[PDB]
Amino acid sequence: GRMHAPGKGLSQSALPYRRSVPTWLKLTSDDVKEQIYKLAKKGLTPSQIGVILRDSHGVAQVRFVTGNKILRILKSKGLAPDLPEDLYHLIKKAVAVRKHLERNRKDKDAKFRLILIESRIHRLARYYKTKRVLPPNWKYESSTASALV
Amino acid sequence: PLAKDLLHPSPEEEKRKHKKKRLVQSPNSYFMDVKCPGCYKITTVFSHAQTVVLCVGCSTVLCQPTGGKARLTEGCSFRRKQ
Amino acid sequence: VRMNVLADALKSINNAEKRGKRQVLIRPCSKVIVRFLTVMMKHGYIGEFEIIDDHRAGKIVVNLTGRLNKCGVISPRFDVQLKDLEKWQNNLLPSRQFGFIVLTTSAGIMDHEEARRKHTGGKILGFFF
Amino acid sequence: SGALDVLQMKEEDVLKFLAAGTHLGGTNLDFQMEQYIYKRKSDGIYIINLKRTWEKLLLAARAIVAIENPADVSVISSRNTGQRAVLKFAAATGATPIAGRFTPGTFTNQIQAAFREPRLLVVTDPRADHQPLTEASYVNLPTIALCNTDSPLRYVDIAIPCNNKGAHSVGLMWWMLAREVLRMRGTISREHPWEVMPDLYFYRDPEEIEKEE
Amino acid sequence: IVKPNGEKPDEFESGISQALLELEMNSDLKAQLRELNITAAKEIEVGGGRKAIIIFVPVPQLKSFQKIQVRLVRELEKKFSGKHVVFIAQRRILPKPTRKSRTKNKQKRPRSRTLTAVHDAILEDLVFPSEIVGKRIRVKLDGSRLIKVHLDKAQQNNVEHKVETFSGVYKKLTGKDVNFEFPEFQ
Amino acid sequence: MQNDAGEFVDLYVPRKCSASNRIIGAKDHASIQMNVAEVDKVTGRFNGQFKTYAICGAIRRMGESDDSILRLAKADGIVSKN
RNA sequence: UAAAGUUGCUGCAGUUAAAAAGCUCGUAGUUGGAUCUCUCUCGGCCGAAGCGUUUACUUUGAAAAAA
């Protein structure tokens, strides 16, 4: 179930058994990679890149075409985001909640939600520091969070 | 029922099941080629697309985002693949 | 969350056998589950089973000959020496005439009698009778 | 049937089933009766697969024929709809009928006057004839029941999927069971139609006849 | 064309290489065969009296070799009458490390070079024109395993005769019994 | 049920359910032993032979006696297919 | 001390008999999914032949007063 919610939803993606490039996809590996580079240069996260390639270019799974994952491709090319996308969005949400709390101090539910979001941020940051994606000196601050976003 | 054959379920039963609870999971979605009356190329659209897909050679909209399957515009022929 | 997928497999087999069903679906599958099932099948307790190969983790359909009184797991996997095997098999087995204690051993996953034959101990995985 | 050409269902039997409304189930379906239906109609009625109906009827006949004493088979009916059908089946086949009230303890209480020890039990409706079904579980008594789409299958060992609501259908099925039992024994042959038409088994509802007369 | 690492081509390998060279000398697909080469070739018996040709191909070339797979296979079958022919990529299996590991074996074993992955890829390309859409493993009471592969239904026509040649090849170079059935409906 | 010499030492050998292979206890009065008459292939008449199916009371209680007996009959060729 | 499975590791309880924190977060703790089958001394039968990342485990073999 959800880490910070009582819900236990089953909704997710179901990858098909076949790992081969679909017959309708005439795009080559280098064509898909160039598409990924162009989308990344627009400032799109790998999730957005995958969604756009799925919804418009017929790319069912970038991994099965290019043999590599979107973040791995962007890291190889060298234009990957400094801090990982999920951590970036968690920090963005925490900054938004703190900005809201600055003007609404009686919003105790917002305070509870901020506590939960910051706990998620700390768990993700600890994981990333374990894997050396983030420097060991990296620390999320309640006073200087809006500089990482 | 006791002796329910769990190895070879009916295709109707497998289509009834949740996509993840199937014997081997398979998506309920598909990729479909849309052809427009005023276009020379066929555009592949996800059945459950989240983006607003414009015409590959025009400004005509192809599909609209929706809670589930994308809503195709009226006037463009969509054919399912595989 | 789910730890000890072997525990889930054995409990599902137990509940299916109690319900009288002829087949049980076990997911996820694993190497330890397959070896335990092979140990159970070599003694005629379950019969033939099949591994449904997803591309993520296994599934298994186990045919159920109505012979299994009980298959269970021991958690944690206590380390068992040969001199201490009799005490375990006196606590866990209904008789000295039937029933097996499964141990994972440097020589493989196998029942306590064959562990005695190979003169070896290991870690107790479970039991079935 | 046993995949036997002689025991396969014939056209006249199918027309009798369709005229009687035998294939018409009900709005509700029991989860243990799903294997006996074909599909649900647009009016919410389940269609009963007549091939499975014939298979279960012949299985019940095979069960009844393997009882050396004809009186050892007891045929029950509590609803008046199947009472005449049960009486006629008992007269034709040699079974013992219980038409009307079934006194509890008829199988389990040996002091009662009506105490009996059947070797086989055939009931019309498992829901209406639930008491003989429950008492058959005290005396090792296997049971045959004419079950509808919504009929519970507890203590029912051979269920014959059929409309057990309409008088025509239940009378026809008791007539068919009698005919199959006699054919399987040897009395009456399979190469000529039975001289008894099924109307001898139908509940009459005397008001209809009296207003017609 | 043929280029064994042991530098000892055989009569059958040389014959296969010269047949491929001839196919270069007159065909409509010469341009692709210029770069392509093979590692080895073997003749095996699938069962009864029939035989199979197994052409081992360098892995990077395999995909390109699969582009012209159907045409070249048909040509080689025509040159070899009733002999079925199959293209297998030559993949090496690094042994599972134990507490005996030397300087070369210091580098961690790639997953693609494990026995499981290599056998799965061998099975995948052994049926190449047909795609594997399912797999089951049946464990018999004696403990033996039988693999049942479900191939694509729409490609059944040109691979059904190849069944029992696929199984023989797999049992030869892999050592596991395999059956090639087709799903009732995909 | 055997001893070292080889003689059988049990008082008796209880029946097993034909649907579950579990032992039918000596006080299972809800259990049945259905006798199903066998039929000559040509004439369709009771030929004196029968197939015997013992069903425990647990199966009859859960409503599975119907399907269990149907499966047993189908396996024996008494009940046809479809 | 056993009886005491009335201290419960084996092996107890926690709806109403005694009992689940008002509720969440959360560090330590505990527990965690599938997956990987030569020998830089060589001499015309003998030895400088390697905890070969490691540990836990298991099976050895030493060594370990008597009473």
Instruction: DSSP for A13-39, please give it.
Output: ----S--SPPTT----HHHHHHHHHHH
Q: Is the peptide bond before A16 cis (omega within 30 degrees of 0)?
A: no
* D167-185 vs D50-65: helix crossing angle, rounded to 10: 50
- F38 contacts F47 by C-beta, under 8 angstroms: yes
Residue of A nearest to B24 (CA): A17
Nucleotide nearest to A5 (CA to C1'): G24
Asked if B28 contacts B22 with a C-beta cutoff of 8 angstroms, the reply is: no
**Looking at chain F, which subunits does it touch, using at least 3 CB pairs closer than 8 Å as the criterion?**
B, C, D
Q: What is the CA radius of gyration of chain C?
A: 14
Asked if F28 and F56 count as a contact pair (C-beta separation under 8 A), the reply is: yes
Give the β-pairing of E50-57 and E84-89: parallel
Interchain CB distance below 8 Å, B18 and A17: no
Q: Do chains D and C touch (3 or more CB pairs under 8 A)?
A: no
Give the single-character DSSP code of F76.
Answer: T
Torsion over CA: A50, A55, A59, A61 (sign): positive
CB-based contacts of E20-25 (< 8 A; 24+ apart in sequence): E20/E76, E23/E72, E23/E75, E23/E76
CA E160 from chain centre, in angstroms, equals 17
Q: Tell me the shortest Cα–Cα distance from C99 to chain B, in angstroms.
A: 26
**Amino acid type, A109:** D
Strands B31-35, B77-80: parallel, antiparallel or unpaired by DSSP?
Answer: antiparallel
Q: How far is CA A106 from CA A101, A117, C44, in A?
A: 8, 19, 68
Phi, psi of E88 (to 5 degrees): -115, 130
What six digits make up the tokens of F42? 């040509």
Answer whether C54 sits within 8 Å of A19, measured CB to CB: no
Give residues 72-111 of chain E lying near strand G (Cβ < 7 A).
93-102, 105-106, 109, 111
User: Do C60 and C28 fall into the same domain?
Assistant: yes
Task: Give the CA count within 13 Å in the CB-facing half-sphere of F1.
Answer: 6
Per the DSSP assignment, residues forming a β-bridge with F54 are: F33
The residues spanned by each domain of chain D are 13-213
CATH number at residue F10: 3.30.1230.20
Task: Show the tokens assigned to C109.
Answer: 């996953």
Name which of F20, E143, F66 is nearest C22 in CA terms: F20
C99 Cβ nearer than 7 Å to chain G strand: no
**Closest chain B C-alpha to F1 CA, distance in angstroms:** 30
Q: Are residues C58 and C73 in the same domain?
A: no
Q: Tell me, what amino acid is at C72? A: G
Report in angstroms the alpha-carbon separations of D132 from D154, F30, F39.
12, 13, 29
* Tokens found for residue A23: 């017959």
Structural domains of chain B, with CATH: 1-82 (2.20.25.100)
Tokens of B22: 């199937």
**Tokens linked to F34:** 């259905």
How far is Cα E132 from Cα B24, in angstroms, rounded to an integer? 13
Candidates E132, E133, E136, E185: best to mutate against B (most CBs of B within 10 A) is: E185
Give the closest of E135, E141, E143 to C47, CB-based.
E141
Residue E109 vs residues D181, E94, E95: alpha-carbon distances, Å: 74, 7, 8
- CB-hemisphere CA count at 13 Å for A120? 19
Residue of B nearest to F66 (CA): B1
The set of strand G positions with any atom below 7 Å of a protein CB reads 10-11, 24-27, 31-38, 51-54, 57-60
Residues D147, D160: contact at Cβ < 8 Å? Answer: yes
Q: How many angstroms away from the CA of B25 is the closest CA of chain E? A: 11
List Cβ neighbours of C76 (8 Å cut-off, separation of 6 or more).
none
What fold characterizes domain D13-213?
Answer: Rossmann fold (3.40.50)
Number of domains in chain F: 1
DSSP letter at F16 equals B
Strands D73-77 and D96-99: parallel
Indicate the angle between helix axes D11-20 and D50-65, nearest 10 degrees.
100
DSSP class of E95: P
Strand partners, E47: E50
Known binder of ligand: residue B63? no
In the complex, which nucleotide's C1' lies nearest to the CA atom of residue E108?
A: G36
Cross-chain residue pair B11–E185, CB shorter than 8 Å: yes
Helices E69-79 and E59-67 pack at an angle, to 10 degrees, of 80
DSSP E62: H
Contacts with F7 (C-beta within 8 Å, 6 or more apart), sequence order: none
Closest chain E residue to A20, measured at CA: E131
Q: Kindly tell me the burial class for residue C16, based on how many C-beta atoms sit within 10 Å of its own C-beta (0-12, 13-18, 19 or more).
A: buried
Q: Which fold has domain A81-149?
A: Helix Hairpins (1.10.287)
- Which residues, including other chains, have CB under 8 Å from residue A41's CB and lie 6 or more apart? A79
CA F56, chain centre distance (Å): 9
Q: By CB neighbour count within 10 A (0-12 exposed, 13-18 middle, 19+ buried), where does C72 fall? A: middle
Q: Are residues C103 and C62 in the same domain?
A: no
The two structure tokens encoding residue A49: 């890149």
User: Tokens 């199947």 — which residue?
Assistant: D82
Dist CA B22 CA A56 (whole Å):
28
Q: Is the dihedral of CA E97, E98, E103, E106 positive or negative?
A: positive
Q: How many residues would you count in chain E?
A: 186
Which nucleotide comes closest to C56 if you measure CA to C1'? G34
Distance between the two ends of chain A, CA-based, in angstroms? 29
Same-domain status, C21 and C33: yes
Closest residue in E to C36 (Cα–Cα): E143
**D138 neighbors D107 (Cβ within 8 angstroms):** yes
The domains of chain A are located at 26-80, 81-149
Closest by CA to E149, choosing from E160, E161, E137, E162, is: E137
SS (H, E, C) chain A: CCCCCCCCCCCCCCCCCCCCCCCCCCCCHHHHHHHHHHHHHCCCCHHHHHHHHHHHCCCCCHHHHHCCCHHHHHHHHCCCCCCCHHHHHHHHHHHHHHHHHHHCCCCHHHHHHHHHHHHHHHHHHHHHHHCCCCCCCCCCCCCCHHHCC
DSSP E112: G
CA separation for the pair E114, E94 (Å, rounded): 6
Three-state secondary structure call for residue D54: helix
Name the domain count of chain C. Answer: 2
Using a 10 angstrom Cβ sphere, with 0-12 exposed, 13-18 middle and 19 or more buried, the burial of residue A62 is buried
Residue given tokens 């393997």 in the structure block: D66
State, as a whole number of angstroms, the distance between the CA of D10 and the C1' of G15: 62
- C-alpha radius of gyration, chain A, whole number: 19
DSSP β-bridge partners for residue B71: B64
Instruction: Give residue E167's identity as a one-letter amino acid code.
Output: S
Strand G contacts in A 67-96 (CB under 7 A): none
Residues of chain B whose C-beta is under 8 A from some C-beta in E?
Answer: 7-8, 11, 24
- Three-state SS at C82: helix
The region, left, alpha or beta by phi > 0 then psi within -120 to 50, assigned to residue F6 is left
Question: Taking Cα atoms as reference points, which of D123, D37, D42 lies closest to residue D77?
Answer: D123
Distance CA D187, CA D179 (A): 9
Q: What is the extent of the structural domain holding F32?
A: 1-82
The number of CA neighbours under 13 Å toward the Cβ of F29 is: 9
Last residue in a domain, options C47, C68, C89: C68
**CB-neighbour burial class of residue C79 (10 A; exposed 0-12, middle 13-18, buried 19+):** exposed
Q: What is the resolution of this structure in A?
A: 2.7
Contact between D54 and F80 (Cβ < 8 Å): no
Containing domain of residue C9, as a range? 1-68
User: What count of other Cβ atoms lies within 10 Å of the Cβ of residue D10?
Assistant: 11
In the structure encoding, which two tokens stand for residue E37, read together? Answer: 């080469």
Q: Are B34 and B62 in contact (CB under 8 A)?
A: yes
Cβ separation C52–E136 shorter than 8 A:
yes
Pairing of strands C122-128, D73-77: unpaired
Q: Which residue, among B7, B69, E133, E95, has the nearest Cα to C24 in the 3D structure?
A: B7
C·F CB contacts under 8 A: 12
Q: Whose structure tokens read 């209809």?
A: D208
